[PDB]
Amino acid sequence: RTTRDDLINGNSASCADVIFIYARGSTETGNLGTLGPSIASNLESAFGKDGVWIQGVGGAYRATLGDNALPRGTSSAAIREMLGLFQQANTKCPDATLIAGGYSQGAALAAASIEDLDSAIRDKIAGTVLFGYTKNLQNRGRIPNYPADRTKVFCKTGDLVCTGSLIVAAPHLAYGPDAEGPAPEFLIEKVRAVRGS
Known about the structure:
Blueprint: H1 6-9, E1 18-23, H2 36-47, E2 52-56, H3 76-92, E3 97-103, H4 105-116, H5 119-122, E4 125-131, E5 151-154, H6 176-180, H7 182-195
Parallel strand pairs: 1-2, 1-3, 3-4, 4-5
PDB class: hydrolase (serine esterase)
Keywords: serine esterase, glycoprotein
Assembly: monomeric
């Protein structure tokens, strides 16, 4: 369903091995929106319900459409909120492997937060998936100060936000199949690469 607060609610004594922090798109519900739940059910099948914690970015992140026009593509209060969640995961579960993702404004939020993070925490994020990335052109398909091999961008042909604009067209709303197959398989692969089996 649309709200998951596994990290905030989780017991430090029984930390999951994998923690997923996700930012929703503009005007979406709960803290996971339309794509988050599909990614979550696939992660649970692979790692088991107790092997992975799903956490959406709520709090000060209102996912307000107009904030797409601010300099960094989102609000300074939202950046502070997501920065705080990464810090909370690092403090509460120091041995957990982190994974992240975001859609639309949430993709810009994920990029800004990851850039401002202290190096020690940024390096624990094994893989990040971005859907309909609003700063795709400006940042040249990258997240500043974060490796390309750990990044996976899904930008469909015809989605204008991936091309320097702020206009919303039909392809911007067609990421469902990607969130159900390719995206979780990439995150699962990146986690297995560092944790093994």
